Amino acid sequence: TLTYDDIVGTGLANKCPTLDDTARGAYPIDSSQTYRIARLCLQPTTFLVKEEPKNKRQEAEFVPTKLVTRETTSLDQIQGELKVNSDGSLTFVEEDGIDFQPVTVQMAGGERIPLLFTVK
Amino acid sequence: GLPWYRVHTVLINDPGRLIAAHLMHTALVAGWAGSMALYELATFDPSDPV
Ligand code: CLA
Ligand code: CLA
Ligand code: CLA
Ligand code: CLA
Ligand code: CLA
Ligand SMILES: CC1=C(/C=C/C(C)=C/C=C/C(C)=C/C=C/C=C(C)/C=C/C=C(C)/C=C/C2=C(C)CCCC2(C)C)C(C)(C)CCC1
Ligand SMILES: CC1=C(/C=C/C(C)=C/C=C/C(C)=C/C=C/C=C(C)/C=C/C=C(C)/C=C/C2=C(C)CCCC2(C)C)C(C)(C)CCC1
Numbered sequence: 604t605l606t607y608d609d610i611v612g613t614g615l616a617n618k619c620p621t622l623d624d625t626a627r628g629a630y631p632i633d634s635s636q637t638y639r640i641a642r643l644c645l646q647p648t649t650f651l652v653k654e655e656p657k658n659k660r661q662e663a664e665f666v667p668t669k670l671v672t673r674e675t676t677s678l679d680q681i682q683g684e685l686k687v688n689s690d691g692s693l694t695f696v697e698e699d700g701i702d703f704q705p706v707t708v709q710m711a712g713g714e715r716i717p718l719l720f721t722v723k
Numbered sequence: 724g725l726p727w728y729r730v731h732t733v734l735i736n737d738p739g740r741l742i743a744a745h746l747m748h749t750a751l752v753a754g755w756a757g758s759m760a761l762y763e764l765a766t767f768d769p770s771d772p773v
């Protein structure tokens with residue numbers, strides 16, 4: 604573990620935790636014991652912006668973009684119940700947390716594309 | 724003295740100022756090139772090469 608001071612200014616704070624190459628096991632679900640997610644976290648790596656095919660509809664694809672803002676992208680502290688379903692499936696239901704971050708990215712032309720990257 | 728259309732004859736045998744002259748010329752032609760570019764970059768639309 605590292606203290607606040609051990610992260611400040613490094614950019615590490617905008618990074619969701621990681622598991623080692625080992626941890627590739629499996630977690631059990633009692634299906635008779637409620638479960639929740641104590642901490643969901645999402646860290647962006649790429650932001651692609653589908654381009655408008657001009658008038659000539661020719662099918663459009665997503666294109667990479669430069670992150671004009673900085674390392675403020677990550678969503679963290681997400682939380683909610685991970686209820687087990689009748690059919691034996693699992694559904695997560697978020698309650699609260701830093702569930703959104705305003706991101707701004709530039710493109711080929713120079714156009715800034717602001718979005719509200721979220722999972723509310 | 725010299726007619727207007729002859730003012731540049733003042734260099735016919737002054738290798739120094741003749742070089743000074745062609746240097747200024749080259750400067751203008753290089754200058755134009757640089758700035759004519761910027762004009763195109765400020766108005767050219769890359770949105771569609773087709
Ligand atoms: C082998 C030696 C040599 C070399 C390499 C040159 C080279 C050049 N001479 Mg030149 N010259 C020489 C001997 C030489 N001369 C002799 C013995 C005489 C008789 C005295 C002349 C008389 C002469 C005249 C009368 C003229 C030239 C011009 C030119 C230039 C025409 C191209 C240009 O303008 O580029 C410009 C674009 C470039 C890409 C920039 C190149 C500049 C370089 C990189 C900087 C060099 C810095 C250095 C300290 C100064 C030396 C300059 C030159 C003497 C090498 C060119 C750089 C013409 C000129 O000066 O036009 C402006 C010109 O009118 N020369
Ligand atoms: C290779 C390029 C070149 C060069 C270096 C020269 C150089 C020279 N010419 Mg000349 N000349 C050229 C091409 C060139 N000429 C061409 C193509 C023509 C036919 C159109 C002439 C016709 C010509 C005549 C009829 C005479 C000269 C004369 C002279 C000498 C005196 C210049 C003078 O004082 O003008 C003075 C210049 C001004 C005060 C007036 C310029 C106004 C111009 C017309 C308006 C346009 C300006 C604009 C920026 C030009 C754009 C350049 C364009 C090519 C991109 C000088 C040695 C004179 C000489 O022999 O004296 C005894 C002379 O009588 N030239
Ligand atoms: C390649 C460009 C060039 C160069 C290197 C020279 C170089 C020279 N000229 Mg010259 N000249 C040029 C173009 C050029 N001229 C043009 C286009 C004209 C008018 C047609 C003249 C008219 C002229 C005269 C009448 C005389 C010279 C003379 C001379 C010599 C002495 C320097 C002098 O006092 O200049 C004089 C300075 C000027 C006339 C230059 C100013 C004019 C320009 C248009 C100003 C540009 C301002 C701005 C950047 C653009 C315009 C703004 C507009 C868009 C609103 C020198 C060798 C003298 C010489 O020794 O003769 C014996 C002389 O008497 N020139
Ligand atoms: C390799 C191509 C080339 C050549 C051969 C020349 C040659 C010449 N340039 Mg030039 N120039 C070039 C490319 C070239 N340029 C480029 C790419 C640029 C950047 C746009 C310039 C910009 C430039 C400037 C700013 C000036 C010159 C001038 C001159 C002349 C100086 C010698 C002289 O005193 O003539 C005496 C003058 C002539 C005999 C006039 C020639 C008539 C031309 C060919 C026709 C165009 C003018 C026309 C009659 C009227 C149109 C006017 C317009 C403004 C509406 C010479 C004829 C200078 C000038 O001419 O001032 C005296 C000058 O000021 N050039
Ligand atoms: C540092 C050196 C340098 C370099 C690398 C460039 C590079 C470039 N310039 Mg450039 N330029 C320079 C100096 C330089 N310039 C200087 C000093 C001037 C002022 C005179 C200019 C003025 C200039 C203009 C006005 C323009 C460029 C342009 C360009 C671009 C297009 C190149 C082109 O197609 O050329 C074309 C090359 C030729 C004209 C062919 C020359 C061959 C001649 C005809 C033969 C000469 C006779 C020869 C002596 C016979 C003996 C040969 C022997 C082997 C048999 C290119 C990026 C263009 C551009 O797109 O704008 C940015 C453009 O419009 N330049
Ligand atoms: C000094 C210096 C500098 C700066 C520089 C600069 C900024 C420059 C600019 C330059 C420029 C910016 C130039 C320009 C030029 C232009 C020109 C030279 C033009 C010309 C034109 C013409 C001549 C035209 C004509 C015509 C007309 C008008 C119409 C009819 C047709 C024709 C085409 C004929 C620096 C900082 C780098 C550093 C070092 C020092
Ligand atoms: C003072 C000083 C100095 C400096 C000096 C110098 C170096 C100057 C220069 C100057 C210069 C060098 C200037 C220039 C000018 C220019 C001009 C005046 C231009 C004009 C142009 C134009 C007008 C353009 C046009 C166009 C258009 C419109 C579009 C098309 C294209 C083109 C671009 C052509 C020093 C450093 C010593 C130090 C101290 C201070």
Ligand SMILES: [Ca+2]
Nearest residue numbers: 654655710714
């Ligand atoms: Ca667009």
